[PDB]
């Protein structure tokens, strides 16, 4: 209402004037379905410039770090009405910013309904459940016979709201959630998406097995690029369209100016022989007219494909990719290390995104394109 005769009742239902002269208010204030004890003594007159405000220790614990805001509102604020308005909204904010202290689930619906749906599913799918029953992780199999996991994080009310679904595979899963839909519904959506992608998975697993995956190491299921090794100290990375995997990916070659050219030229002339009925490897073989090494490892266990500047493999994800256009050096480098070096030198001139300089080891012209 307009007058604080009724508006006070309407907006603080549980504040009981104790004295005849409305001077001791006591009882509860509401917040996020939670009542908190409060005795708010005023002077003989209606002044908040001077008022007492005492609490339950629960209450003070929650309004730790606003004691000043409280004092300021008491002294600046017109009436009690808006005092309680502001205080209440402030309690709302305190709690939401401490959101991590909440979520008693309703057991008569939760723990039972969840077990019933786990029964409906079957106990070969599930892989993980938290002691608080917040986090779950489930398995399904491909027709290929691959384990694909799916984490769900469920709320105090699972059926009410959508369970947040976290999944490895690359393209985004969309789940048409109704409160009528369930774990089985979303599992079926997951199976649908799975069986949709299977082709892409078949391609990725076929490359991981029959080729030397280089840049990704035990790659996860979201990864669509594949830095493959081929010949020696030349790589090709491939990023694949998840919907059209068999379709031509985005492709390129790292390595020697003299090595990389004939690959580019061969790619240009043959690309029409590419055919999306075959596998990516079976198409690469006929387009690039070569076969791949399968992890040429033990022979050359200290041959130093490493930076030759920092002398290390694996600089902060980065790999020795930039090489010398020379038969006698072939000394690989890092982008990072060769830029940092060549920047210093007198001889080094920078065009737009390129630096020409001398190879550290052999002092021959080497080009770096950032």
């Amino acid at each position: 209402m307009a007058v604080t005769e009724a508006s006070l009742l309407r907006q603080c239902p549980l504040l009981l004037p104790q004295n005849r002269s409305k001077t001791v208010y006591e009882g509860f204030i509401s917040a996020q379905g939670r009542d908190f004890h409060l005795r708010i003594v005023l002077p003989e007159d209606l002044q908040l410039k001077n008022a007492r405000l005492l609490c339950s220790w629960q209450l003070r614990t929650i309004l730790s770090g606003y004691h000043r805001i409280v004092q300021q509102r008491m002294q600046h604020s017109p009436d009690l009405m808006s005092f309680m308005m502001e205080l209440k909204m402030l309690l709302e904010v305190a709690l939401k910013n401490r959101q991590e202290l909440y979520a008693l689930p309703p057991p008569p619906q939760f723990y039972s309904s969840l077990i019933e749906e786990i029964g409906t599913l079957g106990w070969d799918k599930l892989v993980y459940a938290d002691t608080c029953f917040s986090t779950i992780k489930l398995k399904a199999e491909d027709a290929s016979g691959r384990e694909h996991l799916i984490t769900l994080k469920l709320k105090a009310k699972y059926p009410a709201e959508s369970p947040d679904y976290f999944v490895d595979f690359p393209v985004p899963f969309c789940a048409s959630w109704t409160p009528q839909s369930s774990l089985i519904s979303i599992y079926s959506q997951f199976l649908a998406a799975i069986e949709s992608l299977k082709a892409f998975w078949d391609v990725m697993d076929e490359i991981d097995e029959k080729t030397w995956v280089l840049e990704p190491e035990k790659p996860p299921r979201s990864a669509t690029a594949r830095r493959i090794a081929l010949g020696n100290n030349v790589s090709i990375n491939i990023e694949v369209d998840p919907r059209h995997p068999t379709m031509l990916p985005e492709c390129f070659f790292l390595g020697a100016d003299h090595v990389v050219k004939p690959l580019g030229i061969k790619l240009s002339r043959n690309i029409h022989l590419w055919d999306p009925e075959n596998s990516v490897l079976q198409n690469l073989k006929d387009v690039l007219e070569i076969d791949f090494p399968a992890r040429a490892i033990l022979e050359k266990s200290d041959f130093t494909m490493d930076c030759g500047i920092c002398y290390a493999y694996q600089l902060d994800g980065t790999i020795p990719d930039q090489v010398c256009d020379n038969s006698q050096c072939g000394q690989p480098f890092h982008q990072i290390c060769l830029y940092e070096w060549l920047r210093g030198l007198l001889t080094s001139r920078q065009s737009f995104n390129i630096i020409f300089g001398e190879c550290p080891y052999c002092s021959k012209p080497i080009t770096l394109k950032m």
Partner: protein, 142 residues
């Protein structure tokens, strides 16, 4: 332009779906050329976007485009005559939709054909002219 492009398109998905999306809006369009351009674009997508992705996911997309093009057999003479020059070559590089193509032609044939024998003008020559307000014009160059 569009011949040059296609080595892109068997490779690409994104670009193909863009070309189609654009040509869609050239077919309803206001200026004349938009149609004969969108026709030329489909003819050439059907031609070299598959011999016959997955074949099940080409035969429905081709038969979708063909659904578009039955409209163009409806449109005026210039836009038709392009499809009669074009269908031979479509079939030549992409044989399999001959069974959809020929019906599509045969149905357009039937609209001018009088299939009772010993009826002496065997063809409807008087419906192959659009005359309104003394504009005397070929539609359907039979």
């Amino acid at each position: 332009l569009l011949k040059a492009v296609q080595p892109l398109l068997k490779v690409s998905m994104s670009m193909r779906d863009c070309l189609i999306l654009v040509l869609r809006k050239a077919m309803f369009a206001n200026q004349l050329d938009a149609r004969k351009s969108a026709v030329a674009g489909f003819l050439l997508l059907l031609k070299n976007f598959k011999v016959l992705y997955n074949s099940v996911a080409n035969e429905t997309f081709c038969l979708e485009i063909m659904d578009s093009l039955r409209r163009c057999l409806s449109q005026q003479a210039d836009v038709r005559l392009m499809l009669y020059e074009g269908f031979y070559d479509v079939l030549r590089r992409n044989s399999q939709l001959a069974n959809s193509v020929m019906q599509t032609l045969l149905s357009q044939l039937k609209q001018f054909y009088e299939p009772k024998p010993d009826l002496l003008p065997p063809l409807k020559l008087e419906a192959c002219i659009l005359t309104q307000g003394d504009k005397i014009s070929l539609q359907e160059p039979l």
